[PDB]
Write a protein that binds this DNA or RNA. Structure first.
Ligand SMILES: O=c1[nH]cnc2c1ncn2[C@@H]1O[C@H](COP(=O)(O)OP(=O)(O)OP(=O)(O)O)[C@@H](O)[C@H]1O
Ligand SMILES: [Ca+2]
Length: 426
DNA sequence: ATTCTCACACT
DNA sequence: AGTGTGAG
């Protein structure tokens, strides 16, 4: 098994929220700019950064006040606020624009508001029979980089790309309709076309990775951003992984990746090949060990899920610092604010996508606790009604109130969370 | 006060 | 059901 059965792409909308604001406000185009939320504390938290601003060092999670110190001409657009919380509807709606276009070309799995995996295997097959057996021109791949090329016996970026692509296409074996390299290349032609259609029909630019699975496709996508696409072939994996830090591979950016590094005493993905599968399973469990043994040879089997819609709809807000909720009627009021936004989105979801959610999940965070959530409770969701929803949410959390007073809430709450789950066809 | 989401494994 | 990890 060489993990070359599929053609999979990962498409990533370049700094998506910024692009949405730049389409809407021409003044912001081709300028260093960022999208922020909650203007009051330190000028707002930055949640998306244009490439012009990233060259000054502006990143996500900065405060806008701090970003302006790195980039004094930074322009800002602020997220819509509804009922005291950031409202992402404009970006969600723009996402649906893009996903609907992508769905014309192949079946897609929505990964987040601005990424989608694409399964191109069948689309490639049909495009290879329509193509008689004729060469693929470099003109069909005007923004494609071939990872690892050029090599062997130019000083500008576009010169290198064309040389890499020339060497790739020159050695391509077009007469064999089953070569995985040829299948990737056709896959890349289809993604150029999909990316052309997205930009024509929305104005949005994006990057893409093309490879044989989601993990390599995702890694590839990040190699030549913005507005470019990268093909990572099976043959390119040993050189690519030989200096690729473990933490860059999807699902290894956290504790598991750190302990792969610490327990095995290695730094790069390719060093994993020297261990037997049993060795890896004993250190990291059957599932992780098998997965690691295959992944470091470029092999991964997670399917592109034919799923363009989320499985839960949730509304959370944080109350950090002295803003932690400390009274009963504070908790009730914010639960109602979250329940009302939830109600808006559930009804819109029942009209568009013909489904009703049946379970309500409530999560709270307590001041002093260490973790994302302190506590998770559920109850039935039988009516899309904000006052019943918030009333029910309070009911299943009210006994977490350590305080003996009826009107006070101790310990103060640093996070409220409502989530609709367990959908049924409607 | 990276916030705000969403998916999945484990038990 | 409830907790913990990982991601965009
Ligand atoms: O903490 C986060 N880390 C990454 N992402 C986050 C985070 N919190 C929320 N998000 C959501 O994930 C969208 C795109 O996150 P992304 O990583 O794909 O990066 P961008 O499009 O900003 O620019 P790129 O770097 O892709 O050119 C963001 O806007 C927002 O909706
Ligand atoms: Ca993106």
């Amino acid at each position: 098994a060489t993990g070359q059965d599929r053609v999979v792409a990962l498409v990533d909308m370049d700094c998506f929220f910024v692009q949405v604001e730049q389409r809407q406000n021409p003044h912001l185009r081709n300028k260093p700019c960022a999208v922020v939320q909650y203007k009051s504390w330190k000028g707002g938290g930055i949640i998306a950064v244009s490439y012009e601003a990233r060259a000054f060092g502006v990143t996500r999670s900065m405060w806008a006040d701090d970003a302006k110190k790195l980039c004094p001409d930074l322009l800002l657009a602020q997220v819509r606020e509804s009922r005291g919380k950031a409202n992402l509807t404009k970006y969600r709606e723009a996402s649906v624009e893009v996903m609907e276009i992508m769905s014309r070309f192949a079946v897609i799995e929505r990964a987040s508001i601005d990424e989608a995996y694409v399964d191109l295997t069948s689309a490639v097959q049909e495009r290879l029979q329509k193509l008689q057996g004729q060469p693929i021109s470099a003109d069909l791949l005007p923004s494609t980089y071939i990872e690892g090329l050029p090599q062997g016996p130019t000083v500008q970026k576009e010169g290198m790309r064309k040389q890499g692509l020339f060497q790739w296409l020159d050695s391509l074996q077009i007469d064999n309709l089953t070569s995985p390299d040829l299948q990737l290349t056709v896959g890349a032609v289809i993604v150029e076309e999909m990316r052309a259609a997205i930009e024509r029909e929305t104005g949005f630019q994006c990057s893409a990775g093309i490879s044989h699975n989601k993990v390599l496709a995702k890694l590839a996508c990040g190699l030549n951003k913005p507005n470019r696409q990268t093909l990572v072939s099976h043959g390119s994996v040993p050189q690519l992984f030989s200096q690729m830090p473990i933490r860059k591979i999807r699902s290894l950016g956290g504790k598991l990746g750190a302990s792969v590094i610490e327990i095995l005493g290695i730094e790069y993905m390719g060093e994993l090949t020297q261990f037997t599968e049993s060795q890896l399973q004993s250190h990291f469990g059957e599932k992780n060990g098998s997965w690691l043994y295959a992944m470091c040879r470029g092999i991964e089997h997670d399917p592109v899920k034919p799923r363009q819609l989320p499985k839960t709809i949730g509304c959370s807000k944080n109350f950090p610092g002295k803003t932690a909720l400390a009274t009963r009627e504070q908790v009730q009021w914010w639960l109602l604010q979250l329940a009302q936004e939830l109600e808006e989105r559930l009804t819109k979801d029942r009209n568009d996508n013909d489904r009703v959610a049946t379970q309500l999940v409530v999560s709270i965070r307590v001041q002093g606790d260490k973790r994302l959530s302190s506590l998770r409770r559920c109850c039935a969701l039988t009516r899309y009604d904000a006052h019943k929803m918030s009333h029910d949410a309070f009911t299943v959390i009210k006994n977490c109130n350590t305080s003996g007073i009826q009107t006070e809430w101790s310990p103060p709450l640093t996070m409220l969370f409502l989530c609709a789950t367990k959908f049924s066809a409607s």
